[PDB]
Amino acid sequence: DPKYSTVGFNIENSYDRLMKTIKEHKLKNYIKESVKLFNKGLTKKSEFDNVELKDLANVLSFGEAKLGDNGQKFNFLFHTASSNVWVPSIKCTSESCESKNHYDSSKSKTYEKDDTPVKLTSKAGTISGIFSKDLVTIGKLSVPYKFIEMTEIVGFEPFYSESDVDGVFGLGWKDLSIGSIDPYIVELKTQNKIEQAVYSIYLPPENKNKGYLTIGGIEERFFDGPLNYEKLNHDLMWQVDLDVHFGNVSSKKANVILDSATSVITVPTEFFNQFVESASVFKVPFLSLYVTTCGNTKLPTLEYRSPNKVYTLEPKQYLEPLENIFSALCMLNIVPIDLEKNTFVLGDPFMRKYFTVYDYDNHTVGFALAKNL
Amino acid sequence: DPKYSTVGFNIENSYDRLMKTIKEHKLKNYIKESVKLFNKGLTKKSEFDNVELKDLANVLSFGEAKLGDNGQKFNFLFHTASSNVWVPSIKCTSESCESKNHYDSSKSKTYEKDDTPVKLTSKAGTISGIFSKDLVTIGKLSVPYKFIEMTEIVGFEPFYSESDVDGVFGLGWKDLSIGSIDPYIVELKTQNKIEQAVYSIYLPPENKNKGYLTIGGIEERFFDGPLNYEKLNHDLMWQVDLDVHFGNVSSKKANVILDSATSVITVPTEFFNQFVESASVFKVPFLSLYVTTCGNTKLPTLEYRSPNKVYTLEPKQYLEPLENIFSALCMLNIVPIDLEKNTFVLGDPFMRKYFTVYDYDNHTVGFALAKNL
Structure with a gap:
């Protein structure tokens, strides 16, 4: 291993x-x-x-990450320019949201309120939500992180509803907040769960439907x-x-x-x-x-x-x-x-x-x- | 009929x-x-x-027309802008000419010399020849006409050599000569072989490989x-x-x-x-x-x-x-x-x-x- x-x-x-x-x-x-x-x-x-x-x-997607101590399951896709992680709120208006996995603040002992509003408006679509602090696991690694709970989602269609994806996991630098939330990977380091604020992407030649993300080190x-x-x-x-x-x-x-x-x-x-x-x-x-x-x-x-x-x-x-x-x-x-x-x-x-x-x-x-x- | x-x-x-x-x-x-x-x-x-x-x-072509009293056979195509008729000379240099039917002045009792040179130079090719007077039959109609005997033919390739055509029969107005040779059809009229200087084209709807030329009248x-x-x-x-x-x-x-x-x-x-x-x-x-x-x-x-x-x-x-x-x-x-x-x-x-x-x-x-x- x-x-x-x-x-x-x-x-x-x-x-x-x-x-x-x-x-x-x-x-x-x-x-x-x-x-x-x-x-x-x-x-x-x-x-x-x-x-x-x-x-x-x-x-590029995976369904092993989870929020809170109860371990609420989510299917993320990775995005290499964004810093934050993004998930559907159980309080999600839109009909996009209805078939997806949801974050219920209430069900998690480790949840802490933030409620600070964020708003992404772009060409494909429009996301409205609030920040929320909880345990964010992958699945070896775990740390309290402030992520975005999405309250209404408009656009990104027909992709979103057809994909079995729930949200976005940031492997980038850009944070929508103005409270300088570090990337998930920097945060793991700030809290000492890894040795180095680094990740590797390995894409095996013989399998173009697979890739491997490795965190906290150079796997020689x-x-x-x-x-x-x-x-x-x-x-x-x-x-x-x-x-x-x-x-x-x-x-x-x-x-x-x-x-x-x-x-x-x-x-x-x-x-x-x-x-x-x-x-x-x-x-x-x-x-x-x-x-x-x-x-x-x-x-x-x-x-x-x-x-x-x-x-x-x-x-x-x-x-x-x-x-x-x-x-x-x-x-x-x-x-x-x-x-x-x-x-x-x-x-x-x-x-x-x-x-x-x-x-x-x-x-x-x-x-x-x-x-x- | x-x-x-x-x-x-x-x-x-x-x-x-x-x-x-x-x-x-x-x-x-x-x-x-x-x-x-x-x-x-x-x-x-x-x-x-x-x-x-x-x-x-x-x-549009046919092989029923013939020159001189001996009735030398030629395959013509019709051309609706030209007045003259055009045939390979037995004295034809070019290799185009070699597989075609030829006009031999010598073999025809009805031949009269003209020897006036003509020269067509165009984009597809170049024809050099001389005028020559002989009996020109189709096959009901017959009259002495001055036509062009081609001595060297350059161009019109690969069409000419691949076609079983020998020369060009003019159903038009334009005469290369400067001795105002009337069209073949005017000439038939000048010499009284028809009643009127007129022709009709009939193209049967059901056969797009056929057409009929009728001369000296309106076929009702x-x-x-x-x-x-x-x-x-x-x-x-x-x-x-x-x-x-x-x-x-x-x-x-x-x-x-x-x-x-x-x-x-x-x-x-x-x-x-x-x-x-x-x-x-x-x-x-x-x-x-x-x-x-x-x-x-x-x-x-x-x-x-x-x-x-x-x-x-x-x-x-x-x-x-x-x-x-x-x-x-x-x-x-x-x-x-x-x-x-x-x-x-x-x-x-x-x-x-x-x-x-x-x-x-x-x-x-x-x-x-x-x-x-």
């Missing part, structure tokens, strides 16, 4: 969702026949294009070779300064965010189009879907260069097989999306190669060559 | 050529699956676009109702002034050419796009091919208005069935192509409805409702 406290979590990935879309809309032979056409090759001609940062999220057994460290360029983001080259295409002094919840590698639009020009990659009409032969010899190693380390992705690391649609066919797990000027994100593909460490104490992030388990 | 001299001719149409392209490139299920997609309907997104006036020509039996006449707006073109409306889309004082050798109805680009917008017509990606359900209730009657007559095309007249690809599927026999400002052409679709008359004496053109034989 591991030295430090580790929890498995499940992932619903872009491949699954794409797969579901294909059975739903009967799209196989369309894709099959379009590919044949490309191969023939009669295409030649050069809102899929429109983002969305929504559509690229995977849902998840990787080979040295751990490199990079300093964060932002106070409240797992984000880092790096030059990036994909062949002759390059971008100096780029902003790259580590989010294992992002399903793909992202890249500015301009950058993507330069990359993809005459790389022999095919864009399937009427689908957010670029495709190529798995043995494609034109495709470069992706390079993310620090001043004292470069991290790379071979084509095998950024191409998902599609054997069940067309033989030796692969989809490209890279997507063009423009965020703030010069900002890239390293999603699931990167973490399948690199074991990754997120250090709150030292404001560092950590990379190493993932083992194969 | 007919009162006036009539010759059948064969037509290689756009449907055949498209059909050939589909077997060649195995394109059925692609089209099938793309249509399904439209129907689903996941398309929504709005050089096929680049013309070509080449690609729209059918080949090919149509129902009155013959309308329109004056030509050009001296040397079968061309006519008409307002044209396709629904709310319209163009006043348009120039419309009658060419039964054109495989489709043409229309300016702007005009076509206005027409096609939300008409529920699908453009198949990577193909010069618009498609729709045969029972489409949004599609208008096409209207070509003269000051004292309007000529119309129902959807049934401008939609070819595609039963062998997808059920109740139809292709649209209308194509967007910009010629001189405001110029439309009435190809094969129109002549399947209208019996058409081409009057050299009176500089008129004539329309009537084709019978069904």
Whole structure:
């Protein structure tokens, strides 16, 4: 067993969702026949294009965490930019809430009132609730934490109601409160339940529906070779300064965010189009879907260069097989999306190669060559 | 039998050529699956676009005409803008010429020298030859005519060599010579072999690989109702002034050419796009091919208005069935192509409805409702 406290979590990935879309809309032979056409090759001609940062999220989730001494069960998803944890109140108005697990302050001996109101208003939806202090367990680790009890939830549909998820567990920095509530992982450290304010994400190569979160230490057994460290360029983001080259295409002094919840590698639009020009990659009409032969010899190693380390992705690391649609066919797990000027994100593909460490104490992030388990 | 001299001719149409392209490139299920997609309907997104006036020509041809008293056999195609007739010389350099039928001045008692050089230079190719006078028969009608004996032929490839055609028989006005050689049909009249300098084209509805040319008269039996006449707006073109409306889309004082050798109805680009917008017509990606359900209730009657007559095309007249690809599927026999400002052409679709008359004496053109034989 591991030295430090580790929890498995499940992932619903872009491949699954794409797969579901294909059975739903009967799209196989369309894709099959379009590919044949490309191969023939009669295409030649050069809102899929429109983002969305929504559509690229995977849902990394687990149902082992629990609130209070009675141990009230909840299904969380992890979110790497948020500091707080979020749960449905038993006092939840909305009809979203009705099929989910609820937090009942009353049923827990360890509950302490806070009642301070919080309000998240965003593009997908609107959450209204109050802070509440209780024992927050995972399941080795336990500590009193102030979390948010949600009283009314509006939006995030149809996702929320269709997902068996109840709420959000913050593995990030951003706290909605103004009473400077530390992240759960900092809090475990403040109260001495771990040795270090750190966690690792390990995403096993051979199972893209699984990932492991480990807390309070470096589990040496998840990787080979040295751990490199990079300093964060932002106070409240797992984000880092790096030059990036994909062949002759390059971008100096780029902003790259580590989010294992992002399903793909992202890249500015301009950058993507330069990359993809005459790389022999095919864009399937009427689908957010670029495709190529798995043995494609034109495709470069992706390079993310620090001043004292470069991290790379071979084509095998950024191409998902599609054997069940067309033989030796692969989809490209890279997507063009423009965020703030010069900002890239390293999603699931990167973490399948690199074991990754997120250090709150030292404001560092950590990379190493993932083992194969 | 007919009162006036009539010759059948064969037509290689756009449907055949498209059909050939589909077997060649195995394109059925692609089209099938793309249509399904439209129907689903996941398309929504709005050089096929680049013309070509080449690609729209059918080949209307026949092998019954003959030169000289010995009756040397030739396979001609008809061309409605040219006045002259064109044949390979037995003195033909080029390798194009080698598999074709040849005119040997020497073998014909009725031959008279001319030897005046002519030269056609155009975008597809280059023809060099000399004039030559001989008996030109079809096969009822016969007259000495001055035609062009081709000495070297360069271009028109791969078409020429693949076609079993030898040369071009002019049913038009434009004479390459400067010795004002009348059209063959005017010449028959000058020499009294017919009563009137006129011909009719009849294109039977039920056989799109056949058409009938009739010379020296109106064969009453090919149509129902009155013959309308329109004056030509050009001296040397079968061309006519008409307002044209396709629904709310319209163009006043348009120039419309009658060419039964054109495989489709043409229309300016702007005009076509206005027409096609939300008409529920699908453009198949990577193909010069618009498609729709045969029972489409949004599609208008096409209207070509003269000051004292309007000529119309129902959807049934401008939609070819595609039963062998997808059920109740139809292709649209209308194509967007910009010629001189405001110029439309009435190809094969129109002549399947209208019996058409081409009057050299009176500089008129004539329309009537084709019978069904």
